[PDB]
Amino acid sequence: MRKAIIVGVGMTPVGEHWRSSLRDLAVEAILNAMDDAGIDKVDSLYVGNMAGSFVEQENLGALIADWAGLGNIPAVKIEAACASGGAAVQEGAKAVLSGLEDVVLVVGVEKMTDAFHGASFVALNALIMRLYMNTYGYKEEDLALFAVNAHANGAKNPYAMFKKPITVETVMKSPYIADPLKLFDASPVCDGAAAVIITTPEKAKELGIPKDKWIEIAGMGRAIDTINLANREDFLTLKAATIAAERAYKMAGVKPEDVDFFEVHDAFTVMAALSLEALGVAKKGEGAKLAIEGQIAIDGDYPIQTMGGLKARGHPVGATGVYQVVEAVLQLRGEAPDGIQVPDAEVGLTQNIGGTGSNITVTVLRRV
Structure with missing residues (x-):
């Protein structure tokens, strides 16, 4: 206990x-x-x-x-x-x-x-990008808003690698890596x-640490999915994300409507949208809609990438999961950089994706 x-x-x-x-x-x-x-x-x-x-x-x-x-x-x-x-x-x-x-x-x-394993990964995320927009009627410009949000929130973060904001034409005129996917759709x-x-x-x-510094590990979830992409149920659903998120929600006793921000695996723009769909925030096909409707801003209903995300703070693989948790703590403590502080943060969530969805972790932190 x-x-x-x-x-x-x-x-x-x-x-x-x-x-x-x-x-x-x-x-x-x-x-x-x-x-x-x-x-x-x-x-x-x-x-x-x-x-x-x-x-x-x-x-x-x-x-x-x-x-x-x-x-x-x-x-x-x-x-x-x-x-x-x-x-x-x-x-x-x-x-x-x-x-x-x-x-x-x-x-x-x-x-x-x-x-060999970065090129193939990029091409796979890109086929996923064409699938997501073609299926749900989205456009490249819509998913670009995910990069604009991250670059905004990183511009107010001394620790980010990318500290200047950008426009949607900044991404829409970046070099293509895939034909859907561009330099600015991708984390560094x-x-x-x-x-x-x-x-x-x-x-x-x-030890005399004030209760002002304490942030509780309230929910923990982690799950695997198949490495074989021909045995996956759907490409536009991250099943391990949902399973881990359910376990962590139940453990912490919260629902997605109760939590005030989401550090997601925005390693590519499609993944931010799919992550929100899989974490319960949005319905299948409506992950990017929040980006079009602006609800992913700091003051918005579903703030994400709160200190720059993976696209602007950066993706130092294997510290990314720890960075997502320190920033969530700093958002739950009030000690967050000026300009990027989720208003009245009580519950935050963090999501680290490994492989093609093969190992996903979700953690729910609460203020105490």
Whole structure:
């Protein structure tokens, strides 16, 4: 009958950090998260990374524990493809919820500016894009609003990689990657590191962290779907998203109408729309309609991409899931950058998609 609360969050700017190492980014996020809680030591470490790889950087937990000076603590790496970050937080909370560890650190870190499966993935998302518009009567210009929303909300975010707003012709005149899909329909590949500190409220009071910093892990859901795309029920439905979302909603006792913002996997514009359809917010075929009707703005009914999303804050795969959770915490605490603060945030949601829908994580955070 325990409860799980995040008491510290920290992150690095997302960008092309050519001169930085995986270490510098990781330890930065960790230290900046252990001070947000005022903490000196953690009990265990969970790591998210979907490869930066010296291969010697495949024993990542022990490296990071050494680099951040945590001690001879337990540490492991969680990986669910591009949802590892999203999953590591979940595994981290289970540790505290188990009763075996009282302060748990979760760090996501990715350096893809190193210093076949991207092309195929792009072409697949693009066939999905043609399917979505042709089926539901949408146009490219409609889905472009998802990029405009992200670039707006990232323009007010010091940590984003893309900090200037844009117009729909900015995307409609970007180079095609696919014939539906363009440069600005697609999130950037980049570096970054984010970190979260999870505890139980008893140890939290024992350590003197004010209840003003506590954000509760209220709902957790994670599900797989088939890797074989010829055995999927529908291409315009992400089934793992729905299953995980249902589990997390039931666990937290909320409904989609109760939650005030959604950090979704807007790795491509089609995925933001499909994510909203699958998370319960919109009906099948009406995911992009919210974008046309503007309801995805900060002040809107269904704010998404609240600090830039994946398209503007950036997609450092495997820290993305941790970034989605730190920003949600910062939106639930009131400590959100000026210009992007969801008005009166009590419940927030986060969604990390790995593979083609093969492993999806949903988490529901509540204020306490």
